[PDB]
Design a protein around this nucleic acid. Structure first.
Ligand code: NA
Ligand code: NA
Length: 330
DNA sequence: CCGACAACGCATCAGC
DNA sequence: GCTGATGCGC
DNA sequence: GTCGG
C-alpha cells in the first residue's frame, strides 16, 4: 500500500481525532467515521493536495475536507493542538488504553484525581477484576502477536481441545486465518456436535475446554466466562533461562454446529469482504449474518435457515466460488 | 432534515 | 433476591 | 462525521 509519508500526516491526524471522539466524547460513530476516513485515505496512491481532492473518496466529507486544508496550509490542526495540551482530555485518553477502562470509567477516574498508571496501582480496590488485569498487562496487551506465535498458540489450543474430546472442532479465525503476519489477539471458534439451536448447551462444553487450557497453564487469567463466550488471558511457555513471552488476549466462543461454519466465515472476515458477501447474498436471494443464511421470499420474509456443514456449502448457495481465506481481504 | 452507523455475551450497577 | 440498564470489548 | 432515505 502507499507509503505513510504520502498522507500519514493526514491519516495520523484523523486517527488522533478518532481516539478523541471515542475516549473523550464517547461518540463511537464519529470514531468510526474518522477511522474510516483515515483508511480510505491510507490506501490512496497519491499525495493529497487539497481538501476537495480527499472529499472525492468515500467516507470523507465537508468537515474533514476543511480539516485537511488547514493541515496542508499550516502543518497542524488547531482543535488538535488544544486537545493535546488539555490535561483532562489527554488523561482520559491515556486511561482508556487500559482494557476494562472505557470512556465512562476513565472519566470517573480523571475526575477524582486518578490520572496515571501509578494512581491506578495505588487505587486497586477502585478497579474491577477486568480492569485490574488490564493494568497488570498494560504493556503486553499493546504488543502485537507475530504469526509464528499464533501458530504455537494454535498448536497448543488444538492439542488440548483434542485431548479433551475428539469430537470437538475449533478454528482460530480473525485476520490470522487469512495469513496475517501479526495478530492483536486470538479468537477461537469452538463447537461440539452435541450442541445445536435446540440442544442442551451443556455448561461444561466451553467450560471443560477453558478447564483444560487452565490445567496446561496456557490460559493465565479470565476476564469473563459464560456458557458460550470466554474472554481471558493466555501465554506460551518459555524455554529454560530464555526470556518469557508476553501475556496475550484470547477469546473462545461456543457456536452451535448448525451455525458453526456460518460464523467461522463471519469472524474470519475481513469486513469489506463480508459486505461484498452481504450485498451479493441479497441479489442472489439470501440473507447472511454470523449465525445463519435464509432464503428470501418475494416480499422480504425470510424462510427457515438452510443446512450448512462447511464454508463452501454457504458459497455454493449464493453460487459463488469458494474464495480461500487468504483472498478474502476484500 | 434526520436516523443508521454491527453486534451482543458478560460483569456489574441501578432500582424495586 | 430479581429484572433491566449500562459499560465494555475494537 | 458521513451517507443517503
Ligand atoms: Na467524500
Ligand atoms: Na479501555
Amino acid at each position: 500500500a502507499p507509503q505513510e509519508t504520502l498522507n500519514g500526516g493526514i491519516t495520523d491526524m484523523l486517527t488522533e481525532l478518532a481516539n478523541f471522539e471515542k475516549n473523550v466524547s464517547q461518540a463511537i460513530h464519529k470514531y468510526n467515521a474518522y477511522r474510516k476516513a483515515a483508511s480510505v485515505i491510507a490506501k490512496y496512491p497519491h499525495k493529497i493536495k487539497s481538501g476537495a481532492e480527499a472529499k472525492k473518496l468515500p467516507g470523507v466529507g465537508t468537515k474533514i475536507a476543511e480539516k485537511i486544508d488547514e493541515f496542508l496550509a499550516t502543518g497542524k490542526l488547531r482543535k488538535l493542538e488544544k486537545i493535546r495540551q488539555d490535561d483532562t482530555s489527554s488523561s482520559i485518553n491515556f486511561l482508556t488504553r487500559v482494557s476494562g477502562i472505557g470512556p465512562s470509567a476513565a472519566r470517573k477516574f480523571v475526575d477524582e484525581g486518578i490520572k496515571t498508571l501509578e494512581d491506578l496501582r495505588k487505587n486497586e480496590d477502585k478497579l474491577n477484576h477486568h480492569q485490574r488485569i488490564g493494568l497488570k498487562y498494560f504493556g503486553d496487551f499493546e504488543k502485537r502477536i507475530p504469526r509464528e506465535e499464533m501458530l504455537q498458540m494454535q498448536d497448543i489450543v488444538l492439542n488440548e481441545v483434542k485431548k479433551v474430546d475428539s469430537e470437538y472442532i475449533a478454528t482460530v479465525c480473525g485476520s490470522f486465518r487469512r495469513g496475517a503476519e501479526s495478530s492483536g489477539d486470538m479468537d477461537v471458534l469452538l463447537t461440539h456436535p452435541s450442541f445445536t439451536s435446540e440442544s442442551t448447551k451443556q455448561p461444561k462444553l466451553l467450560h471443560q475446554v477453558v478447564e483444560q487450557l487452565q490445567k496446561v497453564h496456557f490460559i493465565t487469567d479470565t476476564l469473563s466466562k459464560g456458557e458460550t463466550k470466554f474472554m481471558g488471558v493466555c501465554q506460551l511457555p518459555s524455554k529454560n533461562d530464555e526470556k518469557e513471552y508476553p501475556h496475550r488476549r484470547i477469546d473462545i466462543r461456543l457456536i452451535p454446529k448448525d451455525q458453526y461454519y456460518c460464523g467461522v466465515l463471519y469472524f474470519t472476515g475481513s469486513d469489506i469482504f463480508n459486505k461484498n458477501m452481504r450485498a451479493h447474498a441479497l441479489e442472489k436471494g439470501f440473507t447472511i449474518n454470523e449465525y445463519t443464511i435464509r432464503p428470501l421470499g418475494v416480499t422480504g420474509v425470510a424462510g427457515e435457515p438452510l443446512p450448512v456443514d462447511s464454508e463452501k456449502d454457504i458459497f455454493d448457495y449464493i453460487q459463488w466460488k469458494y474464495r480461500e481465506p487468504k483472498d478474502r481481504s476484500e
